[PDB]
UniProtKB/Swiss-Prot annotation:
Catalytic machinery residues: 15, 33, 104
Protein name: Protease 2A
Subunit structure: Homodimer.
Protein function: Cysteine protease that cleaves viral polyprotein and specific host proteins. It is responsible for the autocatalytic cleavage between the P1 and P2 regions, which is the first cleavage occurring in the polyprotein. Also cleaves the host translation initiation factor EIF4G1, in order to shut down the capped cellular mRNA translation. Inhibits the host nucleus-cytoplasm protein and RNA trafficking by cleaving host members of the nuclear pores. Counteracts stress granule formation probably by antagonizing its assembly or promoting its dissassembly.
Organism: Coxsackievirus A16 (strain G-10)
Reactions that this protein is recorded to catalyse: Selective cleavage of Tyr-|-Gly bond in the picornavirus polyprotein
Binding-site list for Zn(2+) 1: 50, 52, 110, 112
Length: 139
């Protein structure tokens, strides 16, 4: 679990979104596993605007942060789950690191700010849904 709070927006994994998230829907993209809902309270996370390939993510299944090198956002094949059939997920970045399903939502950050959130994993790899291209999150 986990979310990004920036301005009047809440960014979560689309497969973990709640009824309140869907009743206050701003945008969602199943191909990215992202959903953005509106909030009453103001958010203070800074979204990074860069092409960094190094950062640190929070791994709830170890209660620890890990430094990682990660790939550029791209279309990557993702195994079927109870949330989606087998498909290409877009804007996904992979790193070598530990992750379990409940780790989704953990933030990946670089020196510039929030890069994305844990969205996939398996086989000693962890995948992050990028949010750096969502320029509208700031306005
Ligand atoms: C952080 O996620 C995991 C981490 C590790 C493993 C394991 F196979 F090793 F057990 C599995 C997962 N689960 C996932 O990758 N997904 C299930 C939830 C929906 C995700 C999506 N974006 O389509 C895909
Ligand atoms: Zn950066």
């Amino acid at each position: 679990s986990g979310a990004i709070y920036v301005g009047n927006y809440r960014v979560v994994n689309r497969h973990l979104a709640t009824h309140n998230d869907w009743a206050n829907l701003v945008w969602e993209d199943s191909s990215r596993d992202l959903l953005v809902s509106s909030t009453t309270a103001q958010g203070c996370d800074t979204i990074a605007r860069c092409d960094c390939q190094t950062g640190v993510y929070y791994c709830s299944s170890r209660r620890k942060h890990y430094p990682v090198s990660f790939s550029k956002p791209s279309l990557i094949f993702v195994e079927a789950s109870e949330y989606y059939p087998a498909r290409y997920q877009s804007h996904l970045m992979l790193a070598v690191g530990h992750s379990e399903p409940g780790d989704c939502g953990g933030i990946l950050r670089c020196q510039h700010g929030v890069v994305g959130i844990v969205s996939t994993g398996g086989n000693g790899l962890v995948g992050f849904a990028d949010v750096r291209d969502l320029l509208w999150l700031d306005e």
